[PDB]
Amino acid sequence: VQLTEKRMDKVGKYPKELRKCCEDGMRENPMRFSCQRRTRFISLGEACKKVFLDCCNYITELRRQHARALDEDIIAEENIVSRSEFPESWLWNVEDLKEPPKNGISTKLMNIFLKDSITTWEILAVSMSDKKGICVADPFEVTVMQDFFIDLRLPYSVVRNEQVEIRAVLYNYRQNQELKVRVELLHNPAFCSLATTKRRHQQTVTIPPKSSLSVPYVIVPLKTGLQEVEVKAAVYHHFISDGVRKSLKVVPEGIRMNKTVAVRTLDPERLGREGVQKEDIPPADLSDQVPDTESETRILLQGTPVAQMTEDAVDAERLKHLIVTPSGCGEQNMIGMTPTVIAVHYLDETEQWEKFGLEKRQGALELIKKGYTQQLAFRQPSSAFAAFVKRAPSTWLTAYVVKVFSLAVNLIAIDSQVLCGAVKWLILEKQKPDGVFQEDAPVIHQENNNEKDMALTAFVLISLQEAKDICEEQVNSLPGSITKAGDFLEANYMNLQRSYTVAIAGYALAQMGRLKGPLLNKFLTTAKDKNRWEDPGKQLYNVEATSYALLALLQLKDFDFVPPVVRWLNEQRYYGGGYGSTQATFMVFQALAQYQKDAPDHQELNLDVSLQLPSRSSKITHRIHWESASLLRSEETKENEGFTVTAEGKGQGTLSVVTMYHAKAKDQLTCNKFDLKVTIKPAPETEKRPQDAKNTMILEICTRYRGDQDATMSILDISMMTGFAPDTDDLKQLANGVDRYISKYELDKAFSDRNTLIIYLDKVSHSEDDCLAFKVHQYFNVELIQPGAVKVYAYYNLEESCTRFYHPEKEDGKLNKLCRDELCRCAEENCFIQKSDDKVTLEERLDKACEPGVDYVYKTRLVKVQLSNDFDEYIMAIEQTIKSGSDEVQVGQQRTFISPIKCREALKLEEKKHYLMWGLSSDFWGEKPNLSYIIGKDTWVEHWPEEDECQDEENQKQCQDLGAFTESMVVFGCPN
């Protein structure tokens, strides 16, 4: 009968060091997870387990009785001093008093514009006279106040042809007076609203004193892009004439996709042939494209395998363009530093700041500062660095951090205390007397138990060589520690099986010059085609391994093996024109840039690339030259053409071709390495959601790795539906619970295309599904919503992933909101030639079928209907071609007619009934041999009654009409 109070009374007992475990156990669980089940996720001592078990045992039995017979059930908790978001400080300027003094009094008027915030400002003044010293003035208070205020509340984004109900919140601040207001939604042809060109939509509403009021509007957006929604308000009697004009973004009906099409090194001479290089590039697939969406092909020319990267690593707002993945974890956050560090180094050693722009450098140094500042969030006592703040410290991660830090000591100020404590930690605590290094955290990267020892020590030994002559006096046993690790290497190296290790440990040994003879052969013979060190399945790791192998080759000054390797590394960009993950990117970056710095070849740029798109009449002639601030050039086309590229004379660079389009929903057909089951179910209606949430739902994700060993660093990439937002309480509980099912949640809308939630995981079990569930709230009611997507993937091998979509549930006839009037008939107009009036005479048919646009006129017989959630597919067999178009079709063949989901109810096409269809050549979709059709605003659909039922009353009138049409179109066709 209390439950909230029976709680906290149980937390009342138990010592101080224990109330954490009981508190978190008393809580429920987003998953149905049991009490014993919840345990063993719990990470502390067994004293912590005993309390956790005892407490949820206590509570789950107590509320199990509440079901038998509207009362709260939460924790009062301890010490939350909330509210941090305050309006930004302003008026940060300095004025001296130069007015003639009137017995000290030197009045100086100063004019300013108050911010547009309803608040109370506190102006603080501090004087400083070289005659009478400092004088801190009393605070001056300014209460900026407004009576009436409008807030327009739109979803993050709306999908084309969805049915959102936005709301205009109106505030009445007056303390003892209710405001009457005339509010109006303005017409915008971009979306169907209750306001049309015909008549406006204004209505009177009365808002109580010291309160607010919500005014809903239904809008059905017809066009994609950023649309302007404006409500206008005129309050009665007062001449307060206010209005709000926000912009909601209408996204298309699928999911955004940057598909990499080609790469190819551009190097005339080198195998590019004396027949200077000619390059064939195939059209992008785009078979799963969304009907009536744009695509765009971006062709990029790179004067140097490192150029896009150098350009990006330097700029603060393009730095994130190097990585398709989130960056909120121990090693991921290192984008803040690593790229920029190597990129600055690169431009220093090759002397390019002159032509490139010296201004950019001081800008670049500030990034490494910022990145360093960020990285310190992961630093623990002492100097240990963990993958997530306040969690088990990683040997691998520290090693990494030590490298970049050590390689940055020159560029920005690195605290030697921070740096050398870490080197002091790795050596004194993590290195076994054997020379091996230990890992005591859960592994972030690539998993007898050699090679485990051999790889990690290789990685740590590469780190220590950067701190060598910096932590000399600070760390005593550095030089001996490296020796111990170096000796362990050149003994066990000849037993290495995995191609990855042979490279990384090969490089580590090369740094010492201890890669020689039989070991060198081992390193060299491990490369396939003499251009890459690669392993089955481990794709992005091969880019990592190969990069190391290049660094080893450069370390050995063996510049014959190198060319083909640099060619291969150049072309391993499958996620945009880029390598995907952090470790992958920064590794190839470093090594490719190291090739530039260590080359005995003056490989100079005088490239003459010419482009012939079959869509453009004029050729494109780009001339990339060394000694010009760029080394870059790009081109865009809206058409998905196959084109041909020609390079000429001198230079080693790249040619990345990438198209962006919107692929349809539909769950991935072959999840080859990851299992994923996604579920969404309505929560009980008495669940108590936040005050704005219209409706709450439970979203369960269930995932499993298809490997022989657990997957390490992995991500759930959850893009919410529209209006929906995840319960941040439940996610917190999942990450901050003494159980802990998650490493952290991101909730980052990078930008556009629906707001996303990113979940970091330490591992994914290959033994069984790793389920976690959580509440989502729906802050606007919407009809006809498209599925939200979920994607799992290994952070360091993106090649392994799985993409599933989630969607509430039909249950027999999808519902709109609402119809009853023109608002509903407005939306349906968009798709299929709106008859209305229901005249449709024989004479009226002949006029419309004779439009110069009308390409085809079929009599179809609907075979199968495969209605999905996003688009309907009607498979129509052709019964007679009354007029054929550029698409030839045989009588007895089939064509798939696609229609939007918002037009299923209007078309009402019953299976195995006959139809008369026609439309423009604009309706064609997807080239032969199998073509599809798009039922659009120019597609006349009509029911063709069967022969056995032409006898009836409602049909014989319509029947011979079609017969008159059929002949007067075959025998005579169009009159003009």
Partner 1 sequence: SPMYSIITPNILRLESEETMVLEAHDAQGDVPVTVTVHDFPGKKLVLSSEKTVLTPATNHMGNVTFTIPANRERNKFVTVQATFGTQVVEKVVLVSLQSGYLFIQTDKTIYTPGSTVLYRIFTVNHKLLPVGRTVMVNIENPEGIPVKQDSLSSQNQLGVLPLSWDIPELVNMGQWKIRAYYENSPQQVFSTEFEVKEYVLPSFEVIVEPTEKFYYIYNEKGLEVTITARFLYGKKVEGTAFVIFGIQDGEQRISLPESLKRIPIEDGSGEVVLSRKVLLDGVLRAEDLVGKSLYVSATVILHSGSDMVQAERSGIPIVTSPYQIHFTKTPKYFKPGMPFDLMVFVTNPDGSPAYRVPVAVQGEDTVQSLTQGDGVAKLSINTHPSQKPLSITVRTKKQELSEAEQATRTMQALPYSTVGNSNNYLHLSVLRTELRPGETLNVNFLLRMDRAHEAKIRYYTYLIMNKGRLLKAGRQVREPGQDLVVLPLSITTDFIPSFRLVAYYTLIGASGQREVVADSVWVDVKDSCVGSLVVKSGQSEDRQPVPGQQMTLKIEGDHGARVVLVAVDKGVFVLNKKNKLTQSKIWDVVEKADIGCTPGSGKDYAGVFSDAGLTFTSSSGQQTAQRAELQCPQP
Ligand X SMILES: *[C@@H]1O[C@H](CO)[C@@H](O[C@@H]2O[C@H](CO)[C@@H](O[C@@H]3O[C@H](CO[C@@H]4O[C@H](CO)[C@@H](O)[C@H](O)[C@@H]4O)[C@@H](O)[C@H](O[C@@H]4O[C@H](CO)[C@@H](O)[C@H](O)[C@@H]4O)[C@@H]3O)[C@H](O)[C@H]2NC(C)=O)[C@H](O)[C@H]1NC(C)=O
Residues interacting with ligand X, by CB under 6 A? 258, 296, 298, 317, 324, 576, 660
Minimum CB separation from ligand X for residue 625, in Å? 22
Looking at the Cβ atoms of 59 and 658, the one nearer to ligand X is: 658
Looking at the Cβ atoms of 575 and 944, the one nearer to ligand X is: 575
Minimum CB separation from partner 1 for residue 115, in Å? 7
Minimum CB separation from ligand X for residue 661, in Å? 9
Minimum CB separation from ligand X for residue 286, in Å? 13
Minimum CB separation from partner 1 for residue 330, in Å? 11
- Is the separation of the CB atoms in 347 and 594 below 8 Å? no
Looking at the Cβ atoms of 93 and 617, the one nearer to partner 1 is: 93
Residue 119 interacting entry, from ligand X, partner 1, none, C-beta within 5 to 8 Å by type: partner 1
According to DSSP, residue 339 is labeled H
Q: Burial code of 98-113, b = ≥16 C-beta within 10 A, e = fewer?
A: eeeeeeeeeeeeeeee
Residue 132 interacting entry, from partner 1, ligand X, none, C-beta within 5 to 8 Å by type: partner 1
Residue 460 interacting entry, from partner 1, ligand X, none, C-beta within 5 to 8 Å by type: none
Looking at the Cβ atoms of 635 and 692, the one nearer to partner 1 is: 692
Looking at the Cβ atoms of 3 and 324, the one nearer to ligand X is: 324
Which residues share a beta bridge with 878?
860
Residue 480 interacting entry, from ligand X, partner 1, none, C-beta within 5 to 8 Å by type: none
Minimum CB separation from partner 1 for residue 210, in Å? 5
Residue 298 interacting entry, from ligand X, partner 1, none, C-beta within 5 to 8 Å by type: ligand X
**Dihedral angle at the C-alpha atoms of 926, 931, 937, 938, nearest 10 degrees?**
120
Residue 576 interacting entry, from partner 1, ligand X, none, C-beta within 5 to 8 Å by type: ligand X
Q: What SS3 state is found at 746? A: coil
Distance CA 307, CA 863 (A): 55
Residue 155 interacting entry, from ligand X, partner 1, none, C-beta within 5 to 8 Å by type: none
Distance CA 682, CA 776 (A): 10
Minimum CB separation from ligand X for residue 575, in Å? 7
Looking at the Cβ atoms of 324 and 599, the one nearer to ligand X is: 324
Tokens standing for 638? 């809206």
Minimum CB separation from ligand X for residue 199, in Å? 35
Distance CA 361, CA 375 (A): 21
Minimum CB separation from partner 1 for residue 19, in Å? 9
Residue 296 interacting entry, from ligand X, partner 1, none, C-beta within 5 to 8 Å by type: ligand X
Q: How many CA atoms lie within 13 A of 714 on its CB side?
A: 29
Tokens standing for 135? 């004088």
**What are the Cα distances from residue 366, in Å, to 33, 306, 715?**
47, 21, 30
Residue 317 interacting entry, from partner 1, ligand X, none, C-beta within 5 to 8 Å by type: ligand X
Per residue, what are the HEC states of 350-379? CCCHHHHCCHHHHHHHHHHHHHHHHHCCCC
Cα distance from N-terminal residue to C-terminal residue, the chain: 84
What is the helix (H) or strand (E) element at residue 138, kind and residue range?
none
Looking at the Cβ atoms of 8 and 309, the one nearer to ligand X is: 309
Distance CA 916, CA 849 (A): 11
State the CB neighbour count (10 A cutoff) for residue 521: 10
Residue 660 interacting entry, from partner 1, ligand X, none, C-beta within 5 to 8 Å by type: ligand X
Minimum CB separation from partner 1 for residue 380, in Å? 9
Minimum CB separation from partner 1 for residue 776, in Å? 14
- Using a 10 angstrom Cβ sphere, with 0-12 exposed, 13-18 middle and 19 or more buried, the burial of residue 176 is exposed
Distance CA 935, CA 909 (A): 12
Looking at the Cβ atoms of 298 and 688, the one nearer to ligand X is: 298
Residues 6 or more apart in contact with residue 121 via CB below 8 angstroms: 114, 115, 141, 142, 143, 144
- Is the separation of the CB atoms in 251 and 224 below 8 Å? yes
- Is the separation of the CB atoms in 149 and 118 below 8 Å? yes
Distance CA 267, CA 271 (A): 8
- The single residue listed with the structure tokens 């790793």 is 770
- Is the separation of the CB atoms in 546 and 553 below 8 Å? no
Looking at the Cβ atoms of 155 and 576, the one nearer to ligand X is: 576
Residue 971 interacting entry, from ligand X, partner 1, none, C-beta within 5 to 8 Å by type: none
Looking at the Cβ atoms of 2 and 621, the one nearer to partner 1 is: 2
Looking at the Cβ atoms of 69 and 94, the one nearer to partner 1 is: 94
